[PDB]
RNA sequence: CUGGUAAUUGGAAUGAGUACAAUCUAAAUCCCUUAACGAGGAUCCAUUGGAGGGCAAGUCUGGUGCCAGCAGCCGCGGUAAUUCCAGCUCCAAUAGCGUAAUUUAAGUUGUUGCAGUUAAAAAGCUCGUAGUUGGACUUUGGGAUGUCCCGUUACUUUGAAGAAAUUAGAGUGCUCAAAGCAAGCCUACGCUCUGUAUACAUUAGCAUGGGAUAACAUUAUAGGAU
RNA sequence: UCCGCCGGCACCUUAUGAGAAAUCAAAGUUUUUGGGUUCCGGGGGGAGUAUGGUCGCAAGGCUGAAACUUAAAGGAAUUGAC
RNA sequence: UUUUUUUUUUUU
């Protein structure tokens, strides 16, 4: 079946780690997609966003390969992006799905004004940049919906954000850079220091230290 | 972040750099967490007791992690009677 | 860098006013040259057919695009107008009365037809579309 | 001066920004078929009304809670939504206005109500019955399927007293057949 | 039992039309109401544009063969054309749809908010008047309790006043709606004093509180204050 | 010869910065956009042309259009071929 | 460091 090759994979298969937030807290790299499948696999959905052909010139013509862009998300604060290039479309799509699973990140959602109910928009103004494409997200009031193009709109929908205002500059017709800028903007949500985070951090044992004895075998 | 009722709403509370106060993100693989063990009157390590320091990738890439950690440990040892 | 003085509103307004002329769309609609063009700022114009002309298609295409030389009644200017649809040139004759419209690109050539900015809409008071579909008949006189 | 010129009028719908969204087309066709609408214009008109109401509610929610304008207009809007059955008594906050969908407004159509109470075998049957003057709301005959029924008037829906299904005087077809059978 | 199709069968419904009549109307007409008629291929026969991509919809069939033509753009057509001319089928809107100045998209006029090394771009260099811009410094605190103790302007707060119509918006079942300013109870020889609210409104002017940030003027030949 | 301070022409390393990159320790501190101020660009051609003015002995300089035409022209970098 | 000019139109 699955034979983990990493300490994190062993812990996830042994049920020692039960939530993706435990891994996110210590910023540990995730190198096996079975970890994500076990943790949040049931609620994850995938979608192929674009199949892009690329060509390399050779002495005997053009060698064509296909680029697959895949977005995964649970619609509840987790989203991932995957890009893979392969000779066959199916292989590229499979690799892109694996990479999108491996890159899932937590998305912070906040309130525009009054803080009643679940969060509905981005906590603050965030901006992402890939290549020349820059994507800006602005908090929006409840009921405003997702005001974004179809690619950013899909990325935001997979992240579970209910309403947001967006603006884009640059070559947004470069779909890869557009989606990557949106992904970077979403990732930057948890890096902004707000007054609610001013409390002193109270550290907890890392999984590799907490379960060192188990991993010692 | 909390609701009007008072319920915790955030997915998790990220750690903060012990020196720069920056938020340590999930994909920050240059960040480290260190435990400094405490010693009794006989210079023997007391299991389970230590001071924890976290450093973000930004400070470590700058080369300032060493001096910052030295200063933080000096202050914490002075406070904790570890000499 | 930009000027930012609180008392520098006049300079900002004047600079924008001067720089607007670098905009081609703004200059087209503010130079008052539309009145010297064949249509003189109109959507359509009537004219008389002078001669049928064939225009070679641009590369990489190869065809003979059928057009008519039309003199506009209201100012006497001469233009080239495309005659669309198969065999629709047979409904056009010299000295016929034709209604002329733009080619859709606001005074610029369309497709593989070089230097043609107009098309025929009606001939002798009957739309070319009706003639092509046999809905109507071209008046005998 | 022509006094008729002073009468004012306005549009009731807008065309979609993107004509050929496949998902939008599928959803719209599903709604139209479910509610038996004649064209996409009716759905777009309902969407226009819903958007106007939601925009008003969103504008009000931006003002201070103690703002007299917010109080007055919010009470007016909540009363309007309660009168037409869009919102329930428990749904007594402007926030619940933002949670209103096109289906909520469509469920208040006289056609949908006539189908639901059982006077029609299908939504299309309800449509043809309404447009054929077989239905009355109170004592007034109504032949407009888009008629929005208020909560108070919902229980008064009945067959027209001058129609075969509500009174006497059968239709012309039945009378002709009876006359033919008399020989 | 549950759904979809059938120019197969079966009876029901109805308005387009038609027309007594009444009603409407200055008089007519229309609308509303309504005797007698008015539907099965319900011939009482829905159209305008499309079907390579943008952009929803055929690697269907016949013809033409870089021709004729299409094609806003990219491109189709050279003898196996999803793109032309047609048939069939399909797609979008629908009693509407196609085609030929101006707004958005345009952060491609950028004050908010663009650019200037190589994409278009900083004058060859310096001086310099108009213009724009211009360092710091002058009364803080406590005791108490809004109150007591130790020259000219910009700017901001508040108020008045500032036609209607239009815009926003309260109420109101013109059968609904666009509307309109109506109208509702009960049939009392009447009533609701029935309603016909409210908001918005650059700059400039008028009046008022504040004195932080700013601008202009003044300072010592004392000819100064008292 | 050694250690320092100020000012200057430059160089090397590095990214926590920027950038379409090439590269830049200023081309940084920019959608988390605002220190002051001058000039100046708005797809490619027609064209630095026509016309008017002005300076110059002349050559020409400065100022400087339009009609019309067109779907690219162009920047950096990658692979191949040469 | 002698000399070495040229390759119709569309498309693959
Ligand atoms: K040619
Ligand atoms: K061709
Ligand atoms: K198309
Ligand atoms: K053939
Ligand atoms: K053939
Ligand atoms: K086509
Ligand atoms: K050709
Ligand atoms: Mg399609
Ligand atoms: Mg064929
Ligand atoms: Mg065809
Ligand atoms: Mg630009
Ligand atoms: Mg150059
Ligand atoms: Mg240049
Ligand atoms: Mg130069
Ligand atoms: Mg000068
Ligand atoms: Mg230009
Ligand atoms: Mg030669």
Token pair belonging to A42 = 């049931």
Does residue C51 sit in helix, strand or coil?
Answer: strand
d(CA A127, CA D14): 33
Distance C52 CA to E78 C1' (A): 27
Instruction: Provide the residue count of chain B.
Output: 83
What are the distances in angstroms from CA D121 to CA C9, D112, D116, D129, D177?
71, 12, 9, 11, 25
Query: What are the backbone angles phi and psi of residue C55, rounded to the nearest 5°?
Result: -115, 125
d(CA C104, CA C118): 8
Residue spans per domain, chain C: 1-141
Distance C28 CA to E29 C1' (A): 54
d(CA C82, CA C55): 9
Neighbours of A111 (CB within 10 A): 20
Q: Put the strands of the sheet holding A164-169 in their side by side order.
A: A126-130, A133-139, A164-169, A146-147
d(CA B33, CA C44): 77
Q: Shortest CA–C1' contact from C60: which nucleotide?
A: G10
Does residue A7 sit in helix, strand or coil?
Answer: helix
d(CA B45, CA A213): 19
Q: In sequence order, which residues have a C-beta less than 8 Å from that of residue B64 and are 6 or more positions away? A: B19
Which residues is chain D interrupted after (C–N above 2.5 Å)?
A: none
Helices D123-131 and D110-117 pack at an angle, to 10 degrees, of 120
Q: Rg of chain C over CA atoms, in angstroms? A: 21
Furthest C-alpha separation in chain D: 80
Those of residues 77-96 in D touching chain A at CB distance below 8 A are 95
Does residue C44 sit in helix, strand or coil?
Answer: strand
d(CA A168, CA D178): 74
Asked if D52 and D44 touch (Cβ cutoff 8 Å), the reply is no
d(CA D157, CA D109): 12
State the nearest Cα–Cα gap between D97 and chain A, in angstroms.
Answer: 9
Asked if D67 and D78 touch (Cβ cutoff 8 Å), the reply is no
Instruction: Name the experimental technique.
Output: cryo-EM
Q: B28, A27: Cβ pair inside 8 Å?
A: yes
Within a 13 Å sphere around the CA of C82, how many CA atoms are in the beta-carbon half?
A: 24
Pairing relation of β-strands C118-123 and C78-82? parallel
For this experimental structure, what is the resolution in angstroms? 2.4
Q: Shortest CA–C1' contact from C110: which nucleotide?
A: E72
Query: What are the backbone angles phi and psi of residue D27, rounded to the nearest 5°?
Result: -60, -45
Asked if D137 and D155 touch (Cβ cutoff 8 Å), the reply is no
Residue D31 CA to chain centroid, in angstroms?
A: 14
HEC profile of B16-71:
ECCCCCCECCCCCCCCEEEEEEEECCCCCEEEEEEEEEEECHHHHHHCCHHHHHHH
């Amino acid at each position: 079946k699955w034979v983990p090759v990493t300490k994190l994979g062993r812990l996830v298969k042994d049920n020692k780690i039960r939530s993706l937030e435990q891994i996110y807290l210590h910023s540990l790299p995730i190198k096996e997609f079975q970890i994500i499948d076990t943790l949040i696999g049931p609620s994850l959905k995938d979608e192929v966003m674009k199949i892009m052909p690329v060509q390399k010139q050779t002495r005997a013509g053009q060698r064509t390969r296909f680029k697959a862009f895949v977005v995964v998300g649970d619609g509840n604060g987790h989203v991932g992006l995957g890009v893979k290039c392969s000779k066959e479309v199916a292989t590229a799509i499979r690799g892109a799905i694996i990479l999108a699973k491996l890159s899932v990140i937590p998305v912070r959602r906040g309130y525009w004004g009054n803080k009643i109910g679940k969060p509905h928009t981005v906590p603050c103004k965030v901006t992402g940049k890939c290549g020349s494409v820059t994507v800006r997200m602005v908090p929006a009031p409840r009921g405003a919906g997702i005001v974004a193009a179809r690619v950013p709109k899909k990325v935001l929908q997979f992240a579970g954000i209910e309403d947001v205002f967006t603006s884009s500059r640059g070559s947004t017709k470069t779909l890869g850079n557009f989606v990557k800028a949106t992904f970077d903007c979403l990732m930057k949500t948890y890096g902004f220091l707000t007054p609610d985070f001013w409390k002193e951090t109270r550290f907890t044992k890392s999984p590799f230290q907490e379960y060192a004895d188990i991993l010692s075998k | 972040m909390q609701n009007e009722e008072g319920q915790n709403v955030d997915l998790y509370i990220p750690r903060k750099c012990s020196a720069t106060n920056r938020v340590i993100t999930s994909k920050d693989h240059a960040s480290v967490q260190l435990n400094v063990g405490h010693l009794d009157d006989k210079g023997l390590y007391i299991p389970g007791s230590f001071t924890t320091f976290a450093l973000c990738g930004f400070i470590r890439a700058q080369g300032d992690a060493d001096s910052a950690l030295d200063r933080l440990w000096q202050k914490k040892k002075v406070e904790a009677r570890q000499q | 860098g930009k000027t930012r003085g609180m008392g520098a509103g006049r300079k900002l307004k004047s600079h924008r006013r001067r720089q607007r002329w670098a905009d081609k769309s703004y200059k087209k609609s503010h130079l008052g040259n539309e009145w010297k063009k064949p249509f003189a700022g109109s959507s359509h114009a009537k004219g008389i057919v002078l001669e049928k002309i064939g225009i070679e298609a641009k590369q990489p295409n190869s065809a003979i695009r059928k057009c008519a030389r039309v003199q506009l009644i209201k100012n006497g200017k001469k233009i080239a107008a495309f005659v669309p649809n198969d065999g629709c040139l047979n409904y056009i004759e010299e000295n016929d009365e034709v209604l002329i419209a733009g080619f859709g690109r606001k005074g610029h050539a369309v497709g593989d037809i070089p230097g043609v900015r107009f098309k025929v809409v009606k001939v002798s008071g009957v739309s070319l579309l009706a003639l092509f579909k046999e809905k109507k008949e071209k008046p005998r006189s | 001066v022509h006094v008729a010129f002073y009468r004012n009028y306005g549009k009731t719908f807008k065309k979609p920004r993107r004509p050929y969204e496949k998902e939008r087309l599928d959803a719209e066709l599903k709604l139209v078929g479910e509610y038996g609408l004649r064209c996409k214009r009716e759905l777009w008109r309902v969407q226009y009304a819903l958007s106007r109401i939601r925009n008003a509610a969103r504008m009000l929610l931006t003002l201070d809670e103690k703002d007299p304008r917010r109080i007055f207009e919010g009470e007016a809007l909540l009363r309007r939504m309660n009168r037409y059955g869009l919102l329930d008594e428990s749904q007594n906050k402007l926030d619940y206005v933002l949670s209103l969908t096109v289906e909520n407004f469509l469920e208040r159509r006289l056609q949908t109500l006539v189908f639901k109470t059982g006077m029609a075998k299908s939504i299309h049957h309800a449509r043809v019955l309404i447009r054929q003057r077989h239905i009355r709301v109170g004592r007034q005959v109504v032949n407009v399927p888009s008629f929005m029924v208020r909560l108070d008037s919902q229980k008064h829906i009945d067959f027209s007293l001058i129609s075969p299904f509500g009174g006497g005087r059968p239709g012309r077809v039945k009378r002709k057949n009876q006359k033919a059978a008399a020989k």
